[PDB]
mmCIF file of C-alpha atoms and ligand atoms in Angstrom:
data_model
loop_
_atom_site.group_PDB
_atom_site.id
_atom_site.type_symbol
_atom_site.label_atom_id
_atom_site.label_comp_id
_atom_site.label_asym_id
_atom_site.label_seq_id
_atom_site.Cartn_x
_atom_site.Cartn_y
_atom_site.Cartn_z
ATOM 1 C CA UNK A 190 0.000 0.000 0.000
ATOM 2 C CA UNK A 191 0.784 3.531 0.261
ATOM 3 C CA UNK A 192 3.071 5.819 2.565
ATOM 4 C CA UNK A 193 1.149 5.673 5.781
ATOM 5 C CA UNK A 194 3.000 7.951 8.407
ATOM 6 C CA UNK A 195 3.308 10.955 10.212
ATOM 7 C CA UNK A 196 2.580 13.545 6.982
ATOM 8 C CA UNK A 197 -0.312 11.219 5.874
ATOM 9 C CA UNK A 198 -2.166 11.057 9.338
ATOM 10 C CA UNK A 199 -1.587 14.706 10.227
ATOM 11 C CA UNK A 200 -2.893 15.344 6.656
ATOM 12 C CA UNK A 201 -6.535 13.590 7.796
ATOM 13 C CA UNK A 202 -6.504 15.453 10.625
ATOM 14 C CA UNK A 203 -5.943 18.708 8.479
ATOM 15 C CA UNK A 204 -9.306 17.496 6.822
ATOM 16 C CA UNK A 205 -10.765 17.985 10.289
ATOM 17 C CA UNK A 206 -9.401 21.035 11.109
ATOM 18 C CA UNK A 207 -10.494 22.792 7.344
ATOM 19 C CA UNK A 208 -13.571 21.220 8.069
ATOM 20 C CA UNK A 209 -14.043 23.023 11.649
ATOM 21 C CA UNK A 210 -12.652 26.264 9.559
ATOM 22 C CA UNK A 211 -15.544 26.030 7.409
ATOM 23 C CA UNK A 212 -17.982 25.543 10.228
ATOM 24 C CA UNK A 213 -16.404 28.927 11.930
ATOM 25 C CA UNK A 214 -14.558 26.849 14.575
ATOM 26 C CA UNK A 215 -11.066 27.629 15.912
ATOM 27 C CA UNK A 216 -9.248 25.123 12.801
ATOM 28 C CA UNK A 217 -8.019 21.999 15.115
ATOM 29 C CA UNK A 218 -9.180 18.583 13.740
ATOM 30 C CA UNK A 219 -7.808 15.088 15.611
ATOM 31 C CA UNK A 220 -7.782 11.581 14.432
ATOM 32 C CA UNK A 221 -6.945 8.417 16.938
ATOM 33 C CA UNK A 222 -5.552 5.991 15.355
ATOM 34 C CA UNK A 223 -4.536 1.816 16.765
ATOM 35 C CA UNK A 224 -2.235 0.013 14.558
ATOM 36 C CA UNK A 225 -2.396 2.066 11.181
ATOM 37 C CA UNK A 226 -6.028 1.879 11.607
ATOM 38 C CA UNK A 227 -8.335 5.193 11.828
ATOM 39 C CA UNK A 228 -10.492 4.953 15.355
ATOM 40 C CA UNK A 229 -11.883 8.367 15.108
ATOM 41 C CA UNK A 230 -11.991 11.534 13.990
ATOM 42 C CA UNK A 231 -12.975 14.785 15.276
ATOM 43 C CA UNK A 232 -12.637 18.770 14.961
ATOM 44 C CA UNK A 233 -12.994 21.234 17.144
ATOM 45 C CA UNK A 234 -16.579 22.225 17.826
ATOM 46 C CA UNK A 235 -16.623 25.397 20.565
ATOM 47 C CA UNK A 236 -19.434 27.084 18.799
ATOM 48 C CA UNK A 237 -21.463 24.857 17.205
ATOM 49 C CA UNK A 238 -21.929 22.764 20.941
ATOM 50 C CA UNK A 239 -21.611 25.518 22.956
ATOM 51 C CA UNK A 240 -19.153 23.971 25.124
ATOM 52 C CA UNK A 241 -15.676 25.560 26.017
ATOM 53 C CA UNK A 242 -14.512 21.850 26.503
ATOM 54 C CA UNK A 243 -15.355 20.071 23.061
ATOM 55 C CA UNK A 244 -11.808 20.744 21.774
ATOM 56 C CA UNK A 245 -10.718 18.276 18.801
ATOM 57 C CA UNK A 246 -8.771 15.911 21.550
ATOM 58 C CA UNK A 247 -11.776 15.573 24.015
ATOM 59 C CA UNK A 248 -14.018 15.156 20.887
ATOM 60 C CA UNK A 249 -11.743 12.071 19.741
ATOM 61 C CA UNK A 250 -10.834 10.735 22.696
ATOM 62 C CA UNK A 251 -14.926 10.175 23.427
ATOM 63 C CA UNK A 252 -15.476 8.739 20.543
ATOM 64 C CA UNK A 253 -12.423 6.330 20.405
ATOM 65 C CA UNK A 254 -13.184 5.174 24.032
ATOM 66 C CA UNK A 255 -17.034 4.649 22.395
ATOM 67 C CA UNK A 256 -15.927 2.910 19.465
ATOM 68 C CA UNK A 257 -13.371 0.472 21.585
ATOM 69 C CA UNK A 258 -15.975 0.038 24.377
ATOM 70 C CA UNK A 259 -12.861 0.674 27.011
ATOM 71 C CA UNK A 260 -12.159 4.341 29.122
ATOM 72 C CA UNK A 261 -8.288 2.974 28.282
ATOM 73 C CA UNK A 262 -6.956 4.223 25.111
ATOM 74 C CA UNK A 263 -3.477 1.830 25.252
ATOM 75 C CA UNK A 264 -1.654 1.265 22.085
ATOM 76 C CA UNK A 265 -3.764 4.406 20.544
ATOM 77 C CA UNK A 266 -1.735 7.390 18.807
ATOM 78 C CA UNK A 267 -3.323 10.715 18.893
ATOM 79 C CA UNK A 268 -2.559 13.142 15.532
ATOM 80 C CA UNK A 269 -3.550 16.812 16.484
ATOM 81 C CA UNK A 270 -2.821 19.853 14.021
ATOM 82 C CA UNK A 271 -2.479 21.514 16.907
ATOM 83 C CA UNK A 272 0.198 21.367 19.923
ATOM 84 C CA UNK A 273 -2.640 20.400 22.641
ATOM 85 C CA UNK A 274 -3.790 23.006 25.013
ATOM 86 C CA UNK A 275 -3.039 21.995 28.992
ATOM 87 C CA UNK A 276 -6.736 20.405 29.542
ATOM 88 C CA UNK A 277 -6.485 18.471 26.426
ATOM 89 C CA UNK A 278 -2.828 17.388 27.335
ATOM 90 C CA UNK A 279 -3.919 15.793 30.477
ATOM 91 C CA UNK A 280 -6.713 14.195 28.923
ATOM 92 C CA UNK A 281 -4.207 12.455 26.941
ATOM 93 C CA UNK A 282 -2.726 11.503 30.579
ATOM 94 C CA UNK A 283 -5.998 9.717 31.877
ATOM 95 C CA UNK A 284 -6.358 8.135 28.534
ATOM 96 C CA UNK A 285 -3.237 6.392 28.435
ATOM 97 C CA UNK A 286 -2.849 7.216 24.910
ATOM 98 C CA UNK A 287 0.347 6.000 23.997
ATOM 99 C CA UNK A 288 1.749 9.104 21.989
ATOM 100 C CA UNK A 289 0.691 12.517 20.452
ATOM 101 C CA UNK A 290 2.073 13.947 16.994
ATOM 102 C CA UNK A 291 1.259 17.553 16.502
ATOM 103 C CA UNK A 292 2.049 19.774 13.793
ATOM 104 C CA UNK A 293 1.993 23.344 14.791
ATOM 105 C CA UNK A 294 2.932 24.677 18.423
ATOM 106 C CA UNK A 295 0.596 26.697 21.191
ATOM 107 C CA UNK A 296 2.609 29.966 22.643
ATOM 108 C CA UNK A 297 -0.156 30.655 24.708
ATOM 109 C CA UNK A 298 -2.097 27.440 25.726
ATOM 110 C CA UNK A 299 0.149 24.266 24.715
ATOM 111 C CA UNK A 300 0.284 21.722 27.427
ATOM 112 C CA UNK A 301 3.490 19.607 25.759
ATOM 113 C CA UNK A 302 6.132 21.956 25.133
ATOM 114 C CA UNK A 303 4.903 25.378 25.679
ATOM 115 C CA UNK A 304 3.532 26.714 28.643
ATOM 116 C CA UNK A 305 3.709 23.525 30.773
ATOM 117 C CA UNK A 306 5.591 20.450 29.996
ATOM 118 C CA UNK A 307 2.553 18.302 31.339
ATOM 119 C CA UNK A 308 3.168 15.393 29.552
ATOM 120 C CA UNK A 309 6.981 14.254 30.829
ATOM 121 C CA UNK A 310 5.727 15.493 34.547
ATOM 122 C CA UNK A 311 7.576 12.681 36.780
ATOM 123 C CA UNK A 312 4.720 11.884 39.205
ATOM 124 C CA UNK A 313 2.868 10.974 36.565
ATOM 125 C CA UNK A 314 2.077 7.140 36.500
ATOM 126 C CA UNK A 315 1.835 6.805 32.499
ATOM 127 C CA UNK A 316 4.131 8.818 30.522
ATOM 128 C CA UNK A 317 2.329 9.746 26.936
ATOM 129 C CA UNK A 318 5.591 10.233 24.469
ATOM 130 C CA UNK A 319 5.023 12.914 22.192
ATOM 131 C CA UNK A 320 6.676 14.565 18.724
ATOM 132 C CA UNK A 321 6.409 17.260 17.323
ATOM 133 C CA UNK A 322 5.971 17.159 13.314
ATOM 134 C CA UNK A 323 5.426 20.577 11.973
ATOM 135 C CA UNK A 324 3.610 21.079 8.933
ATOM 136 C CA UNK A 325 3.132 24.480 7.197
ATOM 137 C CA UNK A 326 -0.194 24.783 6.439
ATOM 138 C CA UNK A 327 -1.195 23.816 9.874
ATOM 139 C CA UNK A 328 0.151 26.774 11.364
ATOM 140 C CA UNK A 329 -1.017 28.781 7.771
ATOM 141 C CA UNK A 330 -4.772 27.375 9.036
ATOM 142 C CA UNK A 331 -4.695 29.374 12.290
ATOM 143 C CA UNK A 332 -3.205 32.795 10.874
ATOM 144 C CA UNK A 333 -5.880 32.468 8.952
ATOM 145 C CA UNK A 334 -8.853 31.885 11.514
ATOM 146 C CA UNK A 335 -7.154 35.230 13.116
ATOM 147 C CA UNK A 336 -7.303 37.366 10.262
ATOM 148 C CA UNK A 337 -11.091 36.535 10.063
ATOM 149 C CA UNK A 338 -11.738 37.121 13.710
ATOM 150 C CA UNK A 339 -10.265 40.834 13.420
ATOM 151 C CA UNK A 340 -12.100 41.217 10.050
ATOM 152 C CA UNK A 341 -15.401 39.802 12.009
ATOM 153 C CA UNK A 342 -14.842 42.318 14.960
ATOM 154 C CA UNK A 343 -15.533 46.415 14.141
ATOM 155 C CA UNK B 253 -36.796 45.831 46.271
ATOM 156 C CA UNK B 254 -40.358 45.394 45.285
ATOM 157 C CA UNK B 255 -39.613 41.586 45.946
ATOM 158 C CA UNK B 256 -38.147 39.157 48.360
ATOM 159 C CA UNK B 257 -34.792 38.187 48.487
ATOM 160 C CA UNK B 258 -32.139 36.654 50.913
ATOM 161 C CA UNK B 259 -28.661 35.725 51.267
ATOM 162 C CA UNK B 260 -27.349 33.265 49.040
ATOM 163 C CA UNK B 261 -26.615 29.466 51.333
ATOM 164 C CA UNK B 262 -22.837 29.136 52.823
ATOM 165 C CA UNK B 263 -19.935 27.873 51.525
ATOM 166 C CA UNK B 264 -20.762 24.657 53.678
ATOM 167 C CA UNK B 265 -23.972 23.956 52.612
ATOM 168 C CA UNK B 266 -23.253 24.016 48.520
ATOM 169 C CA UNK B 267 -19.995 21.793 49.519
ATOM 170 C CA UNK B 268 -22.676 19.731 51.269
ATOM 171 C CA UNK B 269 -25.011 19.057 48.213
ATOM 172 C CA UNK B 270 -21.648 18.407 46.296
ATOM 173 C CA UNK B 271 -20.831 15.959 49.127
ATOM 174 C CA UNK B 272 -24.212 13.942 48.298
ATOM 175 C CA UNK B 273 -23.777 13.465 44.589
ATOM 176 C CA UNK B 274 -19.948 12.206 46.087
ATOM 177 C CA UNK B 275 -21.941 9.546 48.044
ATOM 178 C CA UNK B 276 -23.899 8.716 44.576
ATOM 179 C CA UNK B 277 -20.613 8.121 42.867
ATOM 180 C CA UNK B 278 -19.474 5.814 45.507
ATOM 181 C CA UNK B 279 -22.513 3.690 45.631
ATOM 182 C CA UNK B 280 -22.139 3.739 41.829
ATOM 183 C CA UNK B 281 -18.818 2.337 41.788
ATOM 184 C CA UNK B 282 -16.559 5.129 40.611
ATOM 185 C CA UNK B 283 -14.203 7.855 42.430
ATOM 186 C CA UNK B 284 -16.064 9.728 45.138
ATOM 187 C CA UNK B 285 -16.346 12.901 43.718
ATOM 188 C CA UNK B 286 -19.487 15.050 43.460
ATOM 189 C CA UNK B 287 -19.407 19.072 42.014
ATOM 190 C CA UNK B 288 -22.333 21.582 41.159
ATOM 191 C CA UNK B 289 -22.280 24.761 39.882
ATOM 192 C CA UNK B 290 -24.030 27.804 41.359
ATOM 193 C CA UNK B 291 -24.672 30.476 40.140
ATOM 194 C CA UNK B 292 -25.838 33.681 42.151
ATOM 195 C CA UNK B 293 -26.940 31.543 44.407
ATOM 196 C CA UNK B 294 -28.843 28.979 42.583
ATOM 197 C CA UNK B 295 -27.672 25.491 41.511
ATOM 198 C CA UNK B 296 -27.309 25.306 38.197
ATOM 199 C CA UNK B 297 -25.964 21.834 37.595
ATOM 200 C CA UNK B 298 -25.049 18.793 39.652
ATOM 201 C CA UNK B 299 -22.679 16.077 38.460
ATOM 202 C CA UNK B 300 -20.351 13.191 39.939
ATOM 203 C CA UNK B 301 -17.572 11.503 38.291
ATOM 204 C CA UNK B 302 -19.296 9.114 35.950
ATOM 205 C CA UNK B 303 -15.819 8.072 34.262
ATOM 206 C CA UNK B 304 -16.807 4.097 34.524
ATOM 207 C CA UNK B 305 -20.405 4.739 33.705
ATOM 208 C CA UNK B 306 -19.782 6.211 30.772
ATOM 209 C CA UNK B 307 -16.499 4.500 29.929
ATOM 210 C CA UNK B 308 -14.781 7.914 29.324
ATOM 211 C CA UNK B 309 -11.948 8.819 31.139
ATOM 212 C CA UNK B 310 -12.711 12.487 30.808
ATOM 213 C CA UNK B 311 -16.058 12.155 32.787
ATOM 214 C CA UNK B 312 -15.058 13.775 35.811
ATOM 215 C CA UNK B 313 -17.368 15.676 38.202
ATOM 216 C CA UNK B 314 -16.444 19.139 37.243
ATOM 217 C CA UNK B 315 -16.487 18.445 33.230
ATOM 218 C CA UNK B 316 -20.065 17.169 33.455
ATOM 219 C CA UNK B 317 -21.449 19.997 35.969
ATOM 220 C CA UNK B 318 -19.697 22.621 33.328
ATOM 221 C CA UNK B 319 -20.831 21.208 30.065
ATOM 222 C CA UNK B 320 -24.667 20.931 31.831
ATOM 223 C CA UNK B 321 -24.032 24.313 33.187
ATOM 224 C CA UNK B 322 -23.123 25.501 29.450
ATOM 225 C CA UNK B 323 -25.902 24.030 28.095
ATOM 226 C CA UNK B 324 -28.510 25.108 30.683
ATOM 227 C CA UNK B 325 -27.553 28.672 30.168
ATOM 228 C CA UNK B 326 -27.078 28.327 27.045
ATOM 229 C CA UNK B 327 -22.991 29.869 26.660
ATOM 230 C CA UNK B 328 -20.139 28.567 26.509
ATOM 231 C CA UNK B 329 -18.919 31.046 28.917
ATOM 232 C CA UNK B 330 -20.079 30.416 32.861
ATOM 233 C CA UNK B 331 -18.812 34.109 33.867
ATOM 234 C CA UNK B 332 -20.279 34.681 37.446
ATOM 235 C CA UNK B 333 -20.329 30.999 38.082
ATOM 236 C CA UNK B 334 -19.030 29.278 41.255
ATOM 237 C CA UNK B 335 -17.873 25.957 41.612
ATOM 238 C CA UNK B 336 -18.436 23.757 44.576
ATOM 239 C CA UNK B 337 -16.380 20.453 44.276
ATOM 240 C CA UNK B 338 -15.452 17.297 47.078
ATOM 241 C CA UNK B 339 -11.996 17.171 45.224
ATOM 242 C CA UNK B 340 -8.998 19.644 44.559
ATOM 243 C CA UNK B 341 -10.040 19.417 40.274
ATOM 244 C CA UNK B 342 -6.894 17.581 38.334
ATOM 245 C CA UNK B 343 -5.045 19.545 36.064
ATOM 246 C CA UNK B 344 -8.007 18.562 33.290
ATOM 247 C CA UNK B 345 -10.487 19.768 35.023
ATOM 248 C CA UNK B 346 -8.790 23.067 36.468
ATOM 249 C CA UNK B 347 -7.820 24.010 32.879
ATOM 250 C CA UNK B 348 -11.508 23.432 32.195
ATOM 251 C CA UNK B 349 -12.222 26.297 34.738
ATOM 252 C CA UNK B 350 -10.412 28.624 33.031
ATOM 253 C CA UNK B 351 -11.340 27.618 29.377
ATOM 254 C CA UNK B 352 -15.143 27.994 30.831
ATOM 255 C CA UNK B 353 -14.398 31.418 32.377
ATOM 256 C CA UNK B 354 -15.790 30.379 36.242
ATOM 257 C CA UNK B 355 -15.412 32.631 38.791
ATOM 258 C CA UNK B 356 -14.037 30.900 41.641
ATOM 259 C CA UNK B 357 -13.701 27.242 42.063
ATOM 260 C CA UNK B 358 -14.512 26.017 46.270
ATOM 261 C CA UNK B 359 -12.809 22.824 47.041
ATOM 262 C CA UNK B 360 -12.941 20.630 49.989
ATOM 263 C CA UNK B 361 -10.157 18.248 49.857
ATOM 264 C CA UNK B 362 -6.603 18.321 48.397
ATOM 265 C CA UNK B 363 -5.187 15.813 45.923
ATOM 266 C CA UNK B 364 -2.234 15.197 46.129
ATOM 267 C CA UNK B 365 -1.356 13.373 43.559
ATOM 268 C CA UNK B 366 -3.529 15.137 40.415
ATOM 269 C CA UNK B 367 -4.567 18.140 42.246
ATOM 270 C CA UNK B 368 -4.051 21.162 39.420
ATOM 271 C CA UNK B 369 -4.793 24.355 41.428
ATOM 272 C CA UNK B 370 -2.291 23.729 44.851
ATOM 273 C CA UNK B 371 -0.639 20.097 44.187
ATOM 274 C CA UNK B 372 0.748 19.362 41.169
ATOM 275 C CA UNK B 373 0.546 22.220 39.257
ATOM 276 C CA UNK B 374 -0.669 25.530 40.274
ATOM 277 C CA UNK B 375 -2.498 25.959 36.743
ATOM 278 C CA UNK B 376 -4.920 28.516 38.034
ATOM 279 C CA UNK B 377 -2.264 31.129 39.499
ATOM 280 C CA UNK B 378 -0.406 30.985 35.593
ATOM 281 C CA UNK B 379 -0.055 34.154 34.691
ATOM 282 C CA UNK B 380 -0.743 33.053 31.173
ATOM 283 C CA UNK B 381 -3.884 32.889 31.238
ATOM 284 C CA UNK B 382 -6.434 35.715 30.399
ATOM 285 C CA UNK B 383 -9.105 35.060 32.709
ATOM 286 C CA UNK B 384 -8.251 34.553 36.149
ATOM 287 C CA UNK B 385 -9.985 31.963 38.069
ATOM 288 C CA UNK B 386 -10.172 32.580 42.104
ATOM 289 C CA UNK B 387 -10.107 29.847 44.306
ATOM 290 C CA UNK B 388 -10.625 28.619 47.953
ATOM 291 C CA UNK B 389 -9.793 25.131 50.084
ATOM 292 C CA UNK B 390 -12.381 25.071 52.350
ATOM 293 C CA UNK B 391 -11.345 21.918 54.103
ATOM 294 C CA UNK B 392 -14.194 19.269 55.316
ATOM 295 C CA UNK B 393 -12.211 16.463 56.636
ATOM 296 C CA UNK B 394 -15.635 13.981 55.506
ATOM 297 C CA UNK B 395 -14.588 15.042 51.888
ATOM 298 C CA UNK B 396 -11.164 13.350 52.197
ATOM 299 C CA UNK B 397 -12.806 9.988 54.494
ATOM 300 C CA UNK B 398 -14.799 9.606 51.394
ATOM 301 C CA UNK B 399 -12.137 9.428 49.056
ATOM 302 C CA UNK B 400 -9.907 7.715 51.377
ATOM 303 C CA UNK B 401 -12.796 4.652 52.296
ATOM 304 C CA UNK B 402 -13.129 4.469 48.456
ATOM 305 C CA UNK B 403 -9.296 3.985 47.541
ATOM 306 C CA UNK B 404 -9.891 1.076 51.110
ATOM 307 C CA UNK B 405 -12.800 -0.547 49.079
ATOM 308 C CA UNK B 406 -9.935 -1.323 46.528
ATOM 309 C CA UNK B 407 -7.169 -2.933 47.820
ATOM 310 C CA UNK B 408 -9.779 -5.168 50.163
ATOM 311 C CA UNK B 409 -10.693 -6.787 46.978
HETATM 312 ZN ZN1 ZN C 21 -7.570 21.423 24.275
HETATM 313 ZN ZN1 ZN C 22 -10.614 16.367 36.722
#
C-alpha cells in the first residue's frame, strides 16, 4: 500500500481542522488511530456545541473510548494539528494514549512543550511520548482563523 | 426591592449538596467525587464523576457539571459561576475552569497526587492565562474519608 506515516495522518486530521474552519470553529481537527487503523476523527466544535470543553482531543478521545468500548486508550496514537492546550494534554494523561504527533505549536495554551511540559511530569504514572511534526499549512490554518476574527470584529 | 430576596446558602452547605452526589458516585462504583455549579446563588448543575459509567476517562465531576451548566444557560462562557467540588479538580479539570471562564472554584479536599490548582501544578495562578480563576480550600475532613474509604474498598478486593 501507500506511505502511511506521520505527513499522511496529520494530513486527515488537516481534513478535520479545514472542516471546523468552514464551520467557523477555531481550525483543530484530531484523528486516533490503533495500529495504522483510523479509530476516530474529530474537529474542534466550541461554537457549534456551545461547550468551552469540546476541543478536537476531548471530541476524539470520546469517541475512540465509544468505538473500543474501554475508558483505556493503550496502544492508541493521537494526531492533532495543533500542539494540545493543557486540559487536552492531560486528557491524553488519563487516557493512556500511547503518543501525540502535533504539527503546529501553542505559545499561549500548549500543554506539551509550551507553557507547561505536562506530559513528561515525573509523578505521573503513564508517561504519553510525544513529537512534534510541523507542517506548514497547519500553522497557515490558524493565521488564517485570526485574520477573520479581526475582520469579524468592528 | 419590590420583591423578596435573601442571602445566598454558605460555603458549607453548597460543599454539602456536592458531598451527596460524592456519596452517589461511591454507591455507583466510581471515584467519590461530586461538584455543582451555582450560580448567584442557585444550583445550576449537579454532576459526579461518571468516568466508569460512561467508559470515558474524561467524565469527571467538574467536566459534566460545566458542560450541563453551558448548556442550561445556554454559553459557553459560565462568567459569574461558582464551583463547589469534594476534590482539589486535576489539572483537566482546572484548565476546564479557566477555558469555561468560572469565577471561583470552592474545594474541599486536596489531591495530592492530580490536584491542578495547589498540588501538582498551580495551573490557576499561571499568569498566562487571560481570565483569572479565584479559588478557595475550604477543608471538610468527611470530603477526604470519602475518598480515602473508596481507595480502602480497593485494595480489600
Ligand atoms: Zn484542548
Ligand atoms: Zn478532573
Amino acid at each position: 500500500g501507500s506511505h502511511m506515516g506521520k505527513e499522511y495522518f496529520l494530513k486527515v486530521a488537516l481534513r478535520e481542522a479545514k472542516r471546523a474552519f468552514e464551520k467557523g470553529e477555531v481550525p483543530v481537527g484530531a484523528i486516533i488511530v490503533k495500529e495504522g487503523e483510523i479509530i476516530s476523527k474529530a474537529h474542534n466544535s466550541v461554537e457549534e456545541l456551545k461547550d468551552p470543553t469540546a476541543h478536537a482531543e476531548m471530541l476524539a478521545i470520546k469517541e475512540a473510548c465509544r468505538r473500543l468500548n474501554t475508558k483505556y486508550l493503550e496502544g492508541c496514537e493521537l494526531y492533532v494539528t495543533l500542539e494540545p492546550c493543557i486540559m487536552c494534554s492531560y486528557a491524553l494523561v488519563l487516557s493512556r494514549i500511547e503518543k501525540v504527533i502535533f504539527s503546529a505549536l501553542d505559545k499561549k495554551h500548549g500543554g506539551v512543550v509550551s507553557v507547561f511540559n505536562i506530559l513528561d511530569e515525573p509523578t505521573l504514572n503513564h508517561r504519553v511520548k510525544w513529537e512534534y511534526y510541523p507542517l506548514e499549512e497547519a500553522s497557515e490554518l490558524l493565521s488564517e482563523f485570526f485574520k477573520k476574527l479581526r475582520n469579524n470584529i468592528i
